[PDB]
Amino acid sequence: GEPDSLEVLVKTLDSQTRTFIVGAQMNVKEFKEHIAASVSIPSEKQRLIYQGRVLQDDKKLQEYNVGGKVIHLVERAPP
């Protein structure tokens, strides 16, 4: 039946893409924590980018309509 999960592709600057399947209401901060082990970047050092814009920690992934899409991941010092 109806999806309660999203497919989210994360592509790092080495051009590796990894796919994650996560809860449809998960937020950006939770997502960074989720992918941290696989991408080898602590959540506080992750910058996620989609359609030219940096994803905000307090927003829900669904607010960016990222289901089935490639998000870019960049490693940067925490602000």
Question: Summed up, what is this model?
Answer:
The PDB classes it as structural genomics, unknown function. The protein has 79 residues and is α+β, with helices and mostly antiparallel strands.
Tell me about this structure:
By secondary structure, the chain is α+β, with helices and mostly antiparallel strands. The protein has one domain: Ubiquitin-like (UB roll). The chain has 1 helix and 5 strands; from the N terminus they run ββαβββ. The chain has a 5-stranded mixed beta sheet, covered by helices on one side. The radius of gyration is 12 Å and the shape is globular. It comes from Homo sapiens.
Q: Which bin fits the share of residues in helices?
A: 10-25%
- From N to C, what is the helix and strand string? EEHEEE
Instruction: Tell me which oligomeric state these chains represent.
Output: monomer
Tell me the total number of β-strands.
Answer: 5
Note the beta-strand portion: 35-45%
Outline, from the CA principal axes? Answer: globular
Query: Termini distance?
Result: 41 Å
CATH topology: Ubiquitin-like (UB roll)
The total tally of domains equals: 1
CATH superfamily: Phosphatidylinositol 3-kinase Catalytic Subunit, Chain A, domain 1
Work out the helix count.
1
What composes the largest sheet? 5 strands, mixed
Estimated structural class = alpha+beta
At CATH's second level, what is the architecture? Roll
CATH class wording: Alpha Beta
Rounded to an integer in angstroms, the radius of gyration calculated over CA atoms is: 12 Å
Main-sheet strand order equals 2-1-5-3-4
